[PDB]
Amino acid sequence: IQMTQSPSSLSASVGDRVTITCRASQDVNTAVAWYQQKPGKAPKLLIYSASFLYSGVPSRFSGSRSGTDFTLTISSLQPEDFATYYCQQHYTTPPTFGQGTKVEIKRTVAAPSVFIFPPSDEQLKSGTASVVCLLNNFYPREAKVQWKVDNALQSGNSQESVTEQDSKDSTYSLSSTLTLSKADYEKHKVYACEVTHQGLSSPVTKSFNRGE
Amino acid sequence: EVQLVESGGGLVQPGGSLRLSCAASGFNIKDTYIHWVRQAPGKGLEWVARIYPTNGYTRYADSVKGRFTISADTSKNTAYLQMNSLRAEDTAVYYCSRWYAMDYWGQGTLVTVSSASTKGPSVFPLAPSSTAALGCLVKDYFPEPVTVSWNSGALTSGVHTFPCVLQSSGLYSLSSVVTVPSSSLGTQTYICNVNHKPSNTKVDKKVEP
Ligand SMILES: [Co+2]
Ligand SMILES: [Co+2]
């Protein structure tokens, strides 16, 4: 038995209505449950037997059935509900989970403030230099970060990482790290980080020169 | 109060073995079914095995059939899961749970199957210039977890601790920063507290402008 979940991704604003559908490949009867999972953490029971609210969760969540089509609906959304939601059948072993539905809180466009960090003197002694670009509390997640070593656009030597949506202002933060050998790092002077974002009218560039 | 806690787990060589224990409080396992559900990082939950402690019947998954063994000890109120011939595919967070819908879970344990040896992290400071930003750089380390706190837990507002990124060395790295007023730069002291249990490495770094 395979359970299929739609939509795989979701982005609805606060107070909106969210509906999440779960298809059963075979008959699973009412033996289904709906779960919610914050990043890492542990799944929390929301709905049991396709319709019944769990003791402890608000009545904003609800569950219904249309044969093999099980839908979980949120009446009023809150920004405390950024999570991935799962549907699980338990009619026959093995108990099958859904593919997951990551819901994102939608908000207004917020430009990112940008900082650039030169490599530390301790890391330079090790033999590696790391230049960090930090994008601070922005929305949406989509952003382009490019590096310009001595005004030369780099390619493939940068790694990126983004935080989960903030529980207060529903923003993301991003880190782009430029990792080079200390030898090449001691070869060039001007290190620059260029950010383009929907909330930036022009692409902002924060930079530093070795020997500042 | 009713809770479940999992122990055991960590770095395991491929083809190796490792056993996980899930202890139960606030209820008797003999009254319910005990489940082990795993989840690879950002890959969704996959059911592994089930046991009914009062009779001992064990139901497994085909992705684990043969090399896994799930047992129970109704007297100690804990369930077990023995895993042999561990593969990289088996790397995941392993949860424990009970039934009938699975209501109460456990925090889980990290089972990592890799040939990379345990390595402690190197911690470097990210200092501000000229709001202002500062942070720490958790360099090559393996395996996860790594706790990062600021001022032993005092500093909590404006902190962003980024997830791990796999590096070309086969080791992980992460950065943790915090948004602070530029006036606080001279007056206030900022220290980040890095905690890597697998290597038993604890480093506190004072980030100085
Ligand atoms: Co089938
Ligand atoms: Co921030």
Side-chain angles (χ1 to χ4, degrees), chain A, chain B residues 1-29 31-56 58 60-64 66-99 101-209:
Chain A
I1 279 174
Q2 195 209 21
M3 306 291 299
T4 89
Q5 225 173 333
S6 179
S8 78
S9 171
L10 199 139
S11 54
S13 303
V14 188
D16 252 26
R17 200 200 190 53
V18 177
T19 80
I20 300 207
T21 325
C22 193
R23 214 75 165 299
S25 68
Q26 316 179 8
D27 177 33
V28 291
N29 210 34
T30 56
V32 67
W34 279 98
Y35 290 64
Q36 150 207 272
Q37 182 194 18
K38 300 291 182 181
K41 302 291 181 61
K44 288 183 127 203
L45 186 70
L46 294 171
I47 306 322
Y48 59 104
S49 281
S51 294
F52 300 124
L53 179 101
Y54 195 43
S55 85
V57 278
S59 289
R60 324 155 43 243
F61 292 97
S62 49
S64 57
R65 199 193 160 148
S66 179
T68 36
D69 295 35
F70 307 167
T71 78
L72 175 100
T73 89
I74 285 173
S75 54
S76 318
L77 208 56
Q78 268 149 337
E80 46 167 356
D81 279 316
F82 173 102
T84 308
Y85 301 89
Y86 291 95
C87 46
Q88 151 204 76
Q89 71 91 13
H90 46 104
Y91 191 119
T92 89
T93 59
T96 325
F97 288 96
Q99 290 78 32
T101 64
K102 337 179 177 191
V103 316
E104 139 176 296
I105 298 331
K106 200 158 188 177
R107 63 153 290 160
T108 67
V109 152
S113 46
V114 175
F115 321 84
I116 178 139
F117 294 105
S120 60
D121 270 294
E122 326 194 2
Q123 212 206 335
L124 292 181
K125 246 175 118 173
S126 180
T128 48
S130 283
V131 202
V132 177
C133 207
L134 165 68
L135 273 60
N136 187 36
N137 295 75
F138 61 91
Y139 182 92
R141 179 201 298 102
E142 296 60 88
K144 176 150 128 223
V145 180
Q146 276 168 147
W147 288 91
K148 261 185 209 96
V149 180
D150 271 353
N151 237 312
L153 166 74
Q154 301 293 313
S155 171
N157 38 323
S158 57
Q159 45 202 275
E160 308 212 349
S161 185
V162 76
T163 69
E164 322 295 335
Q165 216 162 11
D166 186 325
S167 299
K168 321 151 218 172
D169 48 358
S170 295
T171 84
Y172 312 98
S173 288
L174 185 138
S175 69
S176 181
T177 313
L178 169 67
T179 49
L180 316 82
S181 65
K182 182 217 154 123
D184 197 327
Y185 174 67
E186 302 232 308
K187 218 102 91 183
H188 302 125
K189 180 178 199 179
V190 175
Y191 291 90
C193 176
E194 216 187 353
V195 189
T196 85
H197 189 252
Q198 225 154 3
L200 293 177
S201 309
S202 50
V204 316
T205 289
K206 249 102 195 166
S207 64
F208 73 90
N209 297 0
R210 281 205 298 105
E212 70 276 16
Chain B
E1 188 168 1
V2 47
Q3 45 200 129
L4 309 140
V5 62
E6 300 95 308
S7 323
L11 188 269
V12 172
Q13 225 147 18
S17 267
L18 165 70
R19 180 204 276 194
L20 307 190
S21 51
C22 171
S25 325
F27 68 122
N28 312 1
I29 40 163
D31 311 5
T32 70
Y33 296 89
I34 298 314
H35 290 258
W36 286 89
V37 201
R38 72 153 163 221
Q39 167 203 344
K43 296 287 154 113
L45 325 159
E46 157 184 34
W47 174 80
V48 179
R50 171 177 64 91
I51 179 139
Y52 195 26
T54 165
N55 69 41
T58 73
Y60 295 58
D62 296 84
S63 148
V64 315
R67 58 187 136 55
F68 278 36
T69 324
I70 171 184
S71 61
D73 184 324
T74 181
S75 62
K76 322 189 119 171
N77 224 30
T78 87
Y80 285 76
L81 181 105
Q82 242 280 353
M83 341 183 267
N84 309 294
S85 299
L86 277 186
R87 328 175 175 299
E89 213 264 341
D90 301 312
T91 201
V93 155
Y94 281 79
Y95 297 100
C96 162
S97 181
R98 100 193 163 140
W99 259 352
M102 328 182 33
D103 39 11
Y104 297 56
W105 294 57
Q107 235 179 10
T109 39
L110 211 29
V111 169
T112 326
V113 171
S114 175
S115 288
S117 305
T118 292
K119 177 158 163 113
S122 311
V123 171
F124 311 106
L126 312 168
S129 35
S130 312
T131 164
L134 52 68
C136 283
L137 174 71
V138 193
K139 208 52 182 56
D140 317 63
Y141 70 109
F142 191 88
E144 269 219 342
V146 183
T147 279
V148 178
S149 87
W150 278 98
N151 294 336
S152 293
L155 179 39
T156 204
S157 185
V159 176
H160 292 287
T161 291
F162 295 90
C164 35
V165 50
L166 196 129
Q167 297 189 303
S168 98
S169 69
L171 312 188
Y172 302 154
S173 280
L174 82 87
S175 303
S176 168
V177 299
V178 47
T179 310
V180 311
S182 32
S183 321
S184 301
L185 263 40
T187 88
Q188 198 29 249
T189 305
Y190 295 107
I191 313 186
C192 86
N193 316 104
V194 189
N195 190 104
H196 185 239
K197 253 270 281 188
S199 67
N200 270 89
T201 306
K202 260 191 19 163
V203 183
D204 297 40
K205 211 104 207 163
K206 169 198 200 243
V207 201
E208 146 173 14

